[PDB]
Amino acid sequence: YFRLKNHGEINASLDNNSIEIVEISSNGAVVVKQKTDIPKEGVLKLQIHNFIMELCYEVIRAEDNNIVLHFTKEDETNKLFLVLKRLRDERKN
Ligand SMILES: [Cl-]
Please give the distance, rounded to the nearest whole angstrom, from the Cα atom of residue 39 to the centre of ligand 1: 14
What method did the depositors use to determine the structure? X-ray
Count up the domains in the chain and report the number.
Answer: 1
CATH of the domain at 40: 2.40.10.430
Please give the distance, rounded to the nearest whole angstrom, from the Cα atom of residue 93 to the centre of ligand 1: 34
- Phi, psi angles (nearest 5°) of residue 3: -110, 150
Question: What does the alpha-carbon distance between residue 35 and residue 51 come to, in Å, rounded to a whole number?
Answer: 28
Please give the distance, rounded to the nearest whole angstrom, from the Cα atom of residue 15 to the centre of ligand 1: 7
H-type alpha helices, 1-93: 74-92
Instruction: Give the range of the structural domain holding residue 1, as residue numbers without chain letter.
Output: 1-93
DSSP 8-state secondary structure symbol assigned to residue 35:
S
Please give the distance, rounded to the nearest whole angstrom, from the Cα atom of residue 48 to the centre of ligand 1: 18
The rounded Cα 83 to chain-centroid distance in angstroms is: 12
